[PDB]
Amino acid sequence: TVALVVEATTEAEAKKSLREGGLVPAAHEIMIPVGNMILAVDTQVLDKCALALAASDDPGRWFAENESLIHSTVFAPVAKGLHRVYPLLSVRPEVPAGYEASWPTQDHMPGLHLVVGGTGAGKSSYLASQDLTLVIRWGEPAERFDVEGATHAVSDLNEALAVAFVMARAGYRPAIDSFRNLVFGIESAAGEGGISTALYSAMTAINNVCSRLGIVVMVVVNPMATEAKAELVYNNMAASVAGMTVLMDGAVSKQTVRTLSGRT
Amino acid sequence: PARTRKPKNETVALVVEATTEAEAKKSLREGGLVPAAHEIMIPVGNMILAVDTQVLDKCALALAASDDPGRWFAENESLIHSTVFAPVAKGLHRVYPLLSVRPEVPAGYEASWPTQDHMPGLHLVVGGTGAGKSSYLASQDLTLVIRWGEPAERFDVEGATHAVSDLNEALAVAFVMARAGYRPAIDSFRNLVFGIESGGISTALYSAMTAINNVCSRLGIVVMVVVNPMATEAKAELVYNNMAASVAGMTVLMDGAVSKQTVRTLS
Amino acid sequence: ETVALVVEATTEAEAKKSLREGGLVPAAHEIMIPVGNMILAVDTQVLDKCALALAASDDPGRWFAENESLIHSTVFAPVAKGLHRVYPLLSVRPEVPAGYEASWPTQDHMPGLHLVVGGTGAGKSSYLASQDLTLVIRWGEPAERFDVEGATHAVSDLNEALAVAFVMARAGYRPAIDSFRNLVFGIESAGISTALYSAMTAINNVCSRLGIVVMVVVNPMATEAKAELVYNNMAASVAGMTVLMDGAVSKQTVRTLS
Amino acid sequence: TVALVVEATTEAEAKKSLREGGLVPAAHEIMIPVGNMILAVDTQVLDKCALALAASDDPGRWFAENESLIHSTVFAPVAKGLHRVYPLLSVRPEVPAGYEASWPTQDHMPGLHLVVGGTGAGKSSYLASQDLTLVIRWGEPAERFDVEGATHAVSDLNEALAVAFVMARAGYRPAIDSFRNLVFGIESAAGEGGISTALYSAMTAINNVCSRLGIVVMVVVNPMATEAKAELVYNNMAASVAGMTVLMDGAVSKQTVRTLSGRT
Amino acid sequence: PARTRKPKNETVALVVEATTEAEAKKSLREGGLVPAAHEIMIPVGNMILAVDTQVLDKCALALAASDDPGRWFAENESLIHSTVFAPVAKGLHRVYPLLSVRPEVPAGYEASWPTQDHMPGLHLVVGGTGAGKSSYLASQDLTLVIRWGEPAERFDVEGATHAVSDLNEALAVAFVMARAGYRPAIDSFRNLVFGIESGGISTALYSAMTAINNVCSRLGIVVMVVVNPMATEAKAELVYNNMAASVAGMTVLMDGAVSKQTVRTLS
Amino acid sequence: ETVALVVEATTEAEAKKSLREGGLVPAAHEIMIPVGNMILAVDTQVLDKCALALAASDDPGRWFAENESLIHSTVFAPVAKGLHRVYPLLSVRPEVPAGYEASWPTQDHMPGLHLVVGGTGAGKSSYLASQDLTLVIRWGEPAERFDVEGATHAVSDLNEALAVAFVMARAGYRPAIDSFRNLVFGIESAGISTALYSAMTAINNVCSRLGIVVMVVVNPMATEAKAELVYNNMAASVAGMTVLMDGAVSKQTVRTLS
């Protein structure tokens, strides 16, 4: 149960968790700044969901029957002082002890693996080669894939992150198709490539909460850059995340992966 | 000749929104922040609309039973404004960050129009040719044309039309028509193009088309919509490709004739 | 029966009342007019009463000076602040009354706005003088000789400009508004701010609902390069439009009936 | 006495005058829109001041000893609904019956006469030839003129307009040096010349309240335009006011005056 | 080594502003909207500061009587914050539209520095040469330099300086010094240039200089101020001419030497 | 003695209290830090207590993980909303403590920031590895191998980044912040947004007041055309600055004492 309208008005209420409308994250709450929004992941509800999901016979049914638990895993706190109290919020870069990974590449750092390219680049054909559990579908027009494929459709960024976090923590392999609504949604002062700089900070923040969760989430991003600034934009995105695969006319045109070894 | 609004029987909260957690748990109709199972939110720019699928369904069966689609819509403004409305609770933007509409196709969905096996959603008719686009709409055997945001002309007096004033009733009338088995077209989304403010066109126009497209897909309908994106001739092919990537289908019109047509299909 | 100026609905009961009363639901005789990020309303019942009284006067200009309060009751800005949310991307619906007819500005001219664009001072004066207007509603322009000697009524804001023009036209008179200079300057959006076009379509479509034509002088002040495209966008927004160059009519486009 | 903090909260208070914090101008109140500000002139206090000023032996002492009356002549109402109630407010173009004028030119329409040019154009040398009662000094750095000259120094736009209105109504000849703070202060979408379009509407509004008052006020304006857009800017300003004299390197480079006859 | 703030004896209203007409008639110090005869408002960008000439005068006589100007300013933060403050009442922008500061010169005013018969006001020292501008300030026999908005350097430890943190105390210390007969300079207005946001430079920088210039003229003082407008080399002569047109005087510095000097004078 | 988070002064009495308590007047041990349109505060008394405790630990990195709450009490964002008005165009005053000395990053280096700008990933790593740092405070960068294996402490926001660096430096350790990437992205104003420069001057001058040097990695992301002017503006804002090109030092400017 998450507080939706009533927020802390006294110091005593202010010290409560973000779930309860306070301004101080609980021991199991991690704040996720996205543009000028501030989300929160509850790692105990995430643990509960992962344990339960790993016990179920259908990742499909499970998520459809537990949007209550999903909406409790990642939510947007109601207290409005969060931006002031946590100036220029990011997510701290830390990796769990004993973290290992063989996917999407050997020793892939925990974080996001962006699958990047323009429309028609080959992105929804590359995902099929990554041998995923399912594709989390968000912010994209309904396709034949959403009937015949292995999908879970979601509506906002909370559900997208929540289902991805739960799946990965359960030992499953998630992709989000796509972060279109961050690209369109995060308005900010532009850079040399034309993209809002807050889109880059947003990806680092989301990347580093996957880092803290010791997981990798593969995410489709079409940054809508012109031919000229594309290489500058892809370099700023690679500088923001663990891994990035660039697709161009049906073939991989660049791959950058941060690894536990420092080597490819 | 007038339209009956029966404001007595209207239950959408217009000014009182939830102030407690208990109230916040109510439906968007009631001023809460959590949609009931029959409410789907529709984000468009910085606005959040909502469709009531229960009210939508009963409206469609009534419209189908009526003698005259046009007269029914004229007599039932109240039911139209109860089908698609803008909820009053202000926290919806925060609670549902970067909201879209989830891609879905109801079971057993079939469609032969505008093309065989047309995915549910929007079918944009883009271009800039008043003669061409009307002439194209006249060929699709539309039950009527929902007129919105365009200057009055001969057709509004002459043809099978139903004029509306805002995005709520444009979508409501389209939904009620398609659900009832009729063929709606919206002429036009001119006011989304002008009103949604964010190469050449506000990026938020694209997500608003995806959101509205995906509502139609959840409802298992196709709504044909006229859209003139006002692009420079140079950047027009880019904009048309961005728009095709946001929706189920799109027909392009050039100098009075259909030049291009892209359609996502099933099976 | 006065327009609510500060007190707006705070309960669901008050929200159901009319815009005049501070509610959020128009009465059957109220038509909302969205202009930029303002929302005005015309009261067709007050409009019809004013048109009846004006017809009994021997001088339309004097009648409006004698009836300022009735004008502010014909078109007003409702007080309820949730109207933007409740009516998203509001326009005015394109409708023509039963058995409408017209012969001015042209035969079978659709009801709506007729824009008179471009020209020049002495060339705008001439084209307006050639239209046999009952009077020119003067708005947002510096006082010149015409405001002393001519057949005019000076107004101060867009409510009065629209009100006076609506009342004259429903009375059977021919009004022209000189000019929409404060729409052009006042309405800013994403080389013309795009909300000028929908504003004129909205004002155009209330005229069509009222079954009238209102002539309006409007200079978009576009660069001469973008001018031809600018004027195209304007014509696509209204019933009719005349372009003036060097005193003569260079283009006239009119939507008509049969 | 003008209401400064307490504004109408009921319909009954709303119908009171703008001086009393209502939303409806009294019969003697004229609203003056300037950018996104809305001023008000009280013509009865203006009449009282003009009558009293015409009776005094020193326009100088009079204004210095009566800032109370000055601040009651032009003021900024406190009610905030004014922008909504009066959409796209201007001042209506009307001339008093029997209006005559021989200054600054024969049959000069009532309004503003702008004295326009860049810094060093000759503006404070042209004013000395116009044989003025005094120069109202506003928004300009203190000079030797402010000690040795015939001046009244003011601080805001209310005092500038109020002293000008009172002087002219009293049969005296005022100039305002200068409208610098409108040029700098009125921010708005720019035009083809680079100047905010709200500066033009502001000058028409102020022009037409001089029109209603049957007076001419001469006003120094440096619009800060570049050489290219200068001629386009001066034409938009001339299109906004009764009269305009352009100064360029110490000589008049254009004069446009709207007259009662339509002839020069 | 520290600065004594005595917050007990401080009467500037910081959070309670007038809510009634009677309260609105009080001084700006008291949270009202009408300045007392000894308060002059100072508009700077979208902020409105105020100078208390009574407090200013007593401060100047005390500083003149003290043994050490620097120590006094260090011990009297409270009196400094009582000399120049930002009033709390929010309606000041509306009540005083497009506020400036009226041009005035008190009777009998005389001045020999920076030049003979220098009009009271600001004297800007413009340029971009750290070595040049310090070297120029070192030549004017300044009593000390008010350091504000600049990175700490050797001079702050070495020279006759007094560091401050905000525009209020920068102006207050300058006013109290000049009124007492000492020679202040402010190094620098870097934060007005950066903070005032409206060919190349925010136009509001020019009016803020005129407003501050005209306060100094009403006080019968000259305050020398370092100002780097950050202009492109192309548009630098235009910006320097706009700045000279806003103030009593201005010295231009090029590659380590005074190149130009414009000064409005009296008699 | 906790930082007030929601309750700010509403009376003149409460306004006189400290920033920690929700007042509007800093105590003698509070220094305000304006950054863009945020205002933070450092508590030098909590800072000194933290520096004492940290010195008694055998591992600075572990000490900070053990003392998160003390960090948020060293640097915080005060709750009172009138601070912007009360302290116009706020900076931090340039002052150095009595008998300050320094030999790192260079001899007699002024207290303040030392910027390390440009370079590249492997070239930024090398220059930092060559500075003999106690640890690198990692902020706003994606997790890489260095955050697992290196001498680091990861933080989440600018309060923690500044707090950790202040505490280390007052303890006698050498901190470097990698990086100010969220200042560059987060601070927008009128090709660099101008408020980045005053922000660094403000952060620079609190370091000078504290009598410390803090090394900070910052990539302004300027075009290569404007890069040389950009770096000039940055150097004019801080105590010292190193420019890296292709692994080597291409420029180093430092303000010094004697």
XYZ file of N, CA and C in Angstrom, chain E residues 1 3 5 7-16 44 47 49 77 81 86-88 147-154 156-158 163-169 190-197 202 230, chain F residues 8-12 15-16 24-26 28 82 84-96 98 110-111 189-190 194-195 197-198 201 204-205 208-209 233 235-239 255-258:
294
model
N 39.269 34.195 14.720
C 38.883 35.113 13.647
C 37.504 34.792 13.077
N 33.133 36.497 12.396
C 32.229 37.624 12.223
C 31.039 37.469 13.159
N 27.398 37.980 14.189
C 26.024 38.268 13.800
C 25.195 38.326 15.078
N 21.703 38.336 15.892
C 20.369 38.238 15.283
C 19.245 38.665 16.203
N 19.528 38.883 17.486
C 18.506 39.373 18.400
C 18.028 40.755 17.982
N 18.953 41.617 17.567
C 18.654 43.039 17.426
C 18.262 43.401 16.003
N 17.666 42.469 15.263
C 17.446 42.621 13.830
C 15.948 42.690 13.560
N 15.516 43.771 12.908
C 14.104 44.108 12.796
C 13.543 43.952 11.391
N 14.333 43.474 10.432
C 13.808 43.256 9.089
C 12.889 42.042 9.114
N 11.634 42.239 8.714
C 10.704 41.123 8.611
C 11.171 40.159 7.528
N 11.336 38.887 7.901
C 11.874 37.894 6.981
C 10.836 36.934 6.416
N 9.654 36.816 7.029
C 8.709 35.789 6.592
C 7.259 36.244 6.751
N 7.003 37.197 7.648
C 5.654 37.709 7.865
C 5.495 38.973 7.030
N 16.639 44.948 -9.209
C 17.754 44.270 -9.868
C 17.204 42.979 -10.462
N 14.378 40.909 -8.699
C 14.463 41.116 -7.264
C 14.291 42.596 -6.950
N 15.516 44.983 -3.850
C 16.231 45.272 -2.621
C 15.804 46.640 -2.098
N 27.766 42.290 10.960
C 26.900 41.704 9.937
C 25.451 42.133 10.117
N 23.198 43.819 7.268
C 21.967 43.248 6.737
C 20.753 44.112 7.050
N 16.290 42.592 1.347
C 15.251 42.289 0.378
C 13.917 42.212 1.101
N 13.027 43.192 0.938
C 11.763 43.176 1.688
C 10.930 41.942 1.372
N 10.088 41.563 2.331
C 9.382 40.290 2.247
C 8.079 40.391 1.454
N 35.265 42.026 -2.072
C 35.389 40.859 -2.933
C 34.104 40.047 -2.898
N 33.549 39.778 -4.078
C 32.261 39.105 -4.185
C 32.185 38.336 -5.493
N 31.810 37.061 -5.404
C 31.540 36.257 -6.580
C 32.750 35.813 -7.366
N 33.955 36.019 -6.842
C 35.194 35.678 -7.519
C 35.941 34.602 -6.741
N 36.692 33.736 -7.422
C 37.434 32.695 -6.703
C 38.490 33.306 -5.797
N 38.683 32.682 -4.637
C 39.674 33.165 -3.687
C 41.069 33.095 -4.295
N 41.864 34.097 -4.020
C 43.230 34.171 -4.466
C 44.092 34.852 -3.448
N 45.367 34.967 -3.761
C 46.368 35.595 -2.916
C 45.954 36.915 -2.334
N 43.098 37.962 -1.506
C 42.132 37.876 -0.415
C 42.812 37.646 0.932
N 44.010 37.121 0.897
C 44.743 36.852 2.086
C 45.697 37.973 2.333
N 46.280 38.442 1.256
C 47.300 39.468 1.289
C 46.848 40.909 1.428
N 35.771 40.290 2.123
C 34.946 39.355 1.373
C 33.499 39.419 1.843
N 32.571 39.346 0.888
C 31.144 39.265 1.168
C 30.550 38.154 0.309
N 29.278 37.848 0.561
C 28.638 36.683 -0.037
C 27.500 36.999 -0.994
N 26.803 38.123 -0.833
C 25.624 38.393 -1.645
C 25.546 39.872 -2.003
N 24.609 40.186 -2.905
C 24.493 41.543 -3.433
C 24.126 42.544 -2.342
N 23.284 42.140 -1.382
C 22.921 43.031 -0.281
C 24.157 43.584 0.417
N 25.024 42.693 0.900
C 26.164 43.140 1.691
C 27.251 43.766 0.828
N 30.326 39.960 -11.134
C 30.268 38.737 -11.923
C 28.917 38.046 -11.789
N 28.336 38.065 -10.585
C 27.094 37.333 -10.360
C 25.858 38.070 -10.874
N 25.877 39.406 -10.975
C 24.824 40.059 -11.758
C 24.889 39.643 -13.219
N 26.086 39.643 -13.802
C 26.217 39.260 -15.205
C 25.674 37.852 -15.412
N 26.034 36.931 -14.513
C 25.605 35.546 -14.664
C 24.152 35.344 -14.248
N 23.698 36.043 -13.209
C 22.406 35.761 -12.612
C 21.223 36.490 -13.214
N 21.479 37.609 -13.883
C 20.424 38.412 -14.494
C 20.222 37.907 -15.918
N 19.050 37.337 -16.178
C 18.787 36.494 -17.342
C 17.585 37.097 -18.057
N 21.999 40.096 -21.447
C 20.646 40.328 -20.957
C 20.400 41.818 -20.786
N 31.316 39.434 -20.523
C 31.379 38.140 -21.214
C 30.866 38.234 -22.651
N 9.154 24.714 8.053
C 9.980 25.904 7.962
C 9.355 27.021 8.785
N 10.151 28.058 9.022
C 9.695 29.199 9.801
C 8.457 29.829 9.178
N 7.467 30.121 10.021
C 6.309 30.905 9.621
C 6.171 32.201 10.405
N 6.955 32.389 11.466
C 6.936 33.606 12.259
C 8.332 34.213 12.267
N 8.404 35.491 12.652
C 9.695 36.169 12.721
C 10.620 35.492 13.724
N 12.081 32.508 12.085
C 12.945 32.899 10.975
C 14.368 33.170 11.440
N 14.533 33.613 12.686
C 15.859 33.885 13.221
C 16.660 32.623 13.521
N 15.880 31.152 8.585
C 16.399 31.827 7.407
C 17.722 32.534 7.659
N 18.293 32.400 8.850
C 19.544 33.048 9.216
C 20.559 31.958 9.534
N 21.692 31.897 8.839
C 22.685 30.866 9.153
C 23.310 31.103 10.517
N 26.685 30.695 12.949
C 28.085 30.968 12.645
C 28.793 29.758 12.051
N 12.306 31.055 1.569
C 12.662 32.427 1.290
C 14.141 32.721 1.176
N 16.288 32.267 -1.252
C 16.621 32.904 -2.522
C 16.410 34.410 -2.449
N 15.262 34.828 -1.914
C 14.969 36.253 -1.795
C 15.907 36.936 -0.807
N 16.165 36.299 0.337
C 16.859 36.985 1.423
C 18.337 37.185 1.098
N 18.921 36.311 0.276
C 20.344 36.365 -0.057
C 20.487 36.458 -1.572
N 20.327 37.657 -2.132
C 20.257 37.802 -3.593
C 21.606 37.555 -4.251
N 21.579 36.784 -5.342
C 22.773 36.467 -6.126
C 23.862 35.867 -5.243
N 23.435 35.013 -4.314
C 24.319 34.440 -3.309
C 25.545 33.793 -3.935
N 26.700 34.058 -3.330
C 27.931 33.335 -3.615
C 28.463 32.776 -2.304
N 29.734 32.397 -2.275
C 30.446 32.132 -1.033
C 31.629 33.085 -0.984
N 31.905 33.629 0.194
C 32.889 34.700 0.194
C 34.306 34.133 0.120
N 35.190 34.773 -0.649
C 36.571 34.282 -0.767
C 37.413 34.572 0.466
N 37.673 33.542 1.271
C 38.469 33.668 2.483
C 39.309 32.415 2.679
N 40.501 32.593 3.239
C 41.399 31.485 3.554
C 41.660 31.498 5.056
N 43.459 31.115 8.822
C 44.751 31.519 9.359
C 45.788 30.427 9.140
N 46.183 27.305 -3.885
C 45.125 27.955 -3.134
C 44.058 26.932 -2.751
N 43.425 27.092 -1.592
C 42.285 26.234 -1.269
C 41.132 26.522 -2.217
N 20.929 27.284 -17.823
C 20.745 28.731 -17.839
C 21.108 29.232 -19.233
N 21.248 30.547 -19.365
C 21.569 31.162 -20.648
C 22.956 30.751 -21.129
N 25.548 29.522 -18.118
C 26.441 30.377 -17.353
C 26.468 30.047 -15.865
N 25.434 29.387 -15.343
C 25.380 29.124 -13.911
C 26.331 28.012 -13.485
N 29.455 28.140 -14.053
C 30.671 28.834 -13.644
C 30.553 29.376 -12.224
N 29.444 30.051 -11.913
C 29.267 30.568 -10.561
C 29.070 29.442 -9.557
N 32.503 28.403 -8.715
C 33.093 29.436 -7.868
C 32.562 29.348 -6.443
N 33.993 26.316 -5.054
C 35.406 26.632 -4.870
C 35.630 27.429 -3.593
N 34.783 28.424 -3.336
C 35.029 29.335 -2.229
C 34.650 28.752 -0.873
N 37.787 27.068 -0.019
C 38.775 28.024 0.471
C 38.472 28.438 1.905
N 37.191 28.635 2.227
C 36.816 28.921 3.608
C 37.192 27.761 4.522
N 36.983 30.058 -19.184
C 35.975 30.498 -18.225
C 36.000 29.642 -16.966
N 38.632 27.989 -15.669
C 39.817 28.310 -14.884
C 39.627 29.612 -14.119
N 38.941 30.583 -14.724
C 38.678 31.845 -14.046
C 37.701 31.702 -12.888
N 37.081 30.534 -12.723
C 36.094 30.320 -11.677
C 36.642 29.590 -10.459
N 37.820 28.970 -10.553
C 38.294 28.052 -9.523
C 39.749 28.345 -9.180
N 40.236 27.630 -8.163
C 41.616 27.789 -7.716
C 42.601 27.243 -8.740
N 46.150 29.116 -9.074
C 46.365 30.239 -8.173
C 47.088 29.755 -6.926
N 48.103 30.505 -6.508
C 48.967 30.079 -5.420
C 49.114 31.193 -4.394
N 49.641 30.813 -3.235
C 50.076 31.758 -2.221
C 51.565 32.040 -2.419
N 52.191 32.678 -1.436
C 53.643 32.802 -1.416
C 54.184 32.276 -0.093
